[PDB]
Design a protein around this ligand. Sequence first.
Ligand code: VZD
Ligand code: ZN
Length: 257
Amino acid sequence: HWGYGKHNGPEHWHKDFPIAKGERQSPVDIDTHTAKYDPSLKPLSVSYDQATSLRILNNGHSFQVTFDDSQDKAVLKGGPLDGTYRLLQFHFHWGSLDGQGSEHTVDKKKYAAELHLVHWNTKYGDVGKAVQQPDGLAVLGIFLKVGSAKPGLQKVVDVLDSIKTEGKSADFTNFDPRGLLPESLDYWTYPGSLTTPPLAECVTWIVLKEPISVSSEQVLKFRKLNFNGEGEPEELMVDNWRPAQPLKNRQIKASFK
Ligand SMILES: NS(=O)(=O)c1ccc(NS(=O)(=O)CCNC(=O)Nc2ccc(F)cc2)cc1
Ligand SMILES: [Zn+2]
């Protein structure tokens, strides 16, 4: 099916998922001179103290760490959000070179990678129902630039060689996602979509202003992963990012002036 290649990449997705040309697709370029400070936005509440990570998985388009969302353990609230959203998983998008890899861009600037912490609105009962609602998910997006190592990322980096190929998974319990956050929770927000198929328009995007720094050795280990499954031709998992989509009738708001 779909992927990031010449013949199955983002320019092809609309044939199976016509919402790819919809009115609130993600990612988008964040024009910092057009985003408006919104004083009515409240601070984000990231309550990850009780997070219970479960497994880490190569799904053939990225790697993800999953969490127990059967109860309010790791939740996102506040900011633009109404009610409570449970953390389900996080994954990344990254490039073949340090000058590309993020999905969102800031004044057309591309970061080396982008972290997505995926949360779903508990009023819809389960994530499958939430995906069918315009306010069903909230994804917290964090940019990665190459510089100093990120100590809270190293334990993810350490296990990637055990999930090199599509379909492999590993135990990944007792991981603390707070170690992936920057200092500031200043953010931009806009209504958008999943950035991979089915591209459902169900996401409140919350993109942090402050990137985290990761070392060249850490991002190099992202780039050793494979899109392919074991025993089939090796295609390095790089450049698994969708480019910026038309903003159309949308306003990006900033929590900071
Ligand atoms: N790149 S991004 O925008 O951050 C992003 C974030 C998440 C996704 N995909 S997801 O699978 O996790 C969507 C939510 N999970 C489910 O819906 N599962 C499900 C359960 C029961 C059903 F009956 C049907 C489906 C894609 C892109
Ligand atoms: Zn993503």
